Design an enzyme around this catalytic site. Structure first.
Site: not given
Ligand SMILES: *CCC(=O)Nc1cc(N2CCN(C)CC2)ccc1Nc1ncc2c(n1)-n1ccc(C(=O)Nc3c(CC)cccc3CC)c1CC2
Length: 269
Positions: A22, A24, A133
């Site tokens: 859940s 995001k 992990d």
């Molecule tokens: C700033 C512009 C932007 O949107 N960047 C960006 C773009 C993408 N894309 C776009 C293209 N698609 C095809 C693929 C995905 C991915 C990521 C990002 N930048 C970004 N910046 C900060 C964070 C993150 N991404 N990001 C993605 C996922 C997490 C994260 O915390 N993941 C986890 C979750 C989800 C809530 C749960 C549990 C564990 C994790 C760690 C893997 C983050 C953190 C911040």
């Protein structure tokens, strides 16, 4: 045209850029139209032990803001009985989505990414954290530099049971053998998983990716008579790094400090 509030600051949501259960991640704008990533975590079904694990992770994210630029920037957060909102830097892309789209990897970019990962993981080890992990999804590319997103302290997250959601998730491709034999986790466990990431960046697959039966895959990972293939490549130093990281005995496995002094990371071109 949606918005959210974090410490009395309004953010406009542009799009969802991540999801785990859940939980995001949203691409957002603040009042000054500056871009951030807001990570949302649902606390509604969390017990005291799970809640503490999230508090612990935030505490470390906060503390390590000083200790390394190889850890994701955390600007602000709001925590309540219902949820956590974390205001973080918006990186270019996560390493997993990057590796998916890339046909082949430049040798110098692979080397640089490798050094960033080692430095990020060495930092958390120095604070007594073993991730346990690690995979490409845990690293963020920020202006051609990799940063660790999370520390792995929290083991549980409310599943996604509403969006048009997948039960067939969570690979064991990067799992070290000592974790399976115990079923002994130490910093050497993170070296194995990092080894698997570099192996993928070298050969285009993880060492046991061909084994599609998960039970057979776990048996192969702990089986010393299952020889991991290291095909000959021009970079003999890279070949050597991979053989040192993927030793089944953790006591024989190379340490991160040794990896940071290896010719592969230190000597270029
Ligand atoms: C700033 C512009 C932007 O949107 N960047 C960006 C773009 C993408 N894309 C776009 C293209 N698609 C095809 C693929 C995905 C991915 C990521 C990002 N930048 C970004 N910046 C900060 C964070 C993150 N991404 N990001 C993605 C996922 C997490 C994260 O915390 N993941 C986890 C979750 C989800 C809530 C749960 C549990 C564990 C994790 C760690 C893997 C983050 C953190 C911040």
């Amino acid at each position: 045209f949606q918005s959210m509030s974090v410490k009395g600051r309004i953010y406009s949501i542009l799009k969802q850029i991540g999801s785990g259960g859940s939980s995001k991640v949203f691409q957002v704008l603040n009042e000054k139209k500056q871009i951030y990533a807001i990570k949302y975590v649902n606390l509604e079904e969390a017990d005291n032990q799970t809640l503490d694990s999230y508090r612990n992770e935030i505490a470390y994210l906060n503390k390590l803001q000083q200790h390394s630029d190889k850890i994701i920037r955390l600007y602000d957060y709001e925590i309540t009985d219902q949820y956590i909102y974390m205001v973080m830097e918006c990186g270019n892309i996560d390493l997993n989505s990057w590796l998916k789209k890339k046909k082949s990897i430049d040798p110098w970019e692979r080397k640089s990414y490798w050094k960033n990962m080692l430095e990020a993981v060495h930092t958390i080890h120095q604070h007594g954290i073993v991730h346990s992990d690690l995979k490409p999804a845990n690293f963020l590319i920020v202006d051609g530099m990799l940063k660790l997103i999370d520390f792995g302290i929290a083991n549980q997250m409310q599943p996604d049971t509403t969006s048009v959601k997948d039960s067939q998730v969570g690979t064991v491709n990067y799992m070290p053998p000592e974790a399976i034999k115990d079923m002994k986790i130490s910093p050497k466990s993170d070296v194995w998983s990092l080894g698997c990431i570099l192996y993928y960046m070298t050969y285009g697959k993880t060492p046991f990716q061909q084994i599609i039966n998960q039970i057979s895959k776990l048996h192969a990972i702990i089986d010393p008579n299952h020889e991991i293939e290291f095909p000959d490549i021009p970079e003999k130093d890279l070949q050597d790094v991979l053989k040192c990281c993927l030793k089944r005995d953790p006591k024989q496995r190379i340490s991160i400090p040794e990896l940071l002094a290896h010719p592969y990371v230190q000597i270029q071109t």
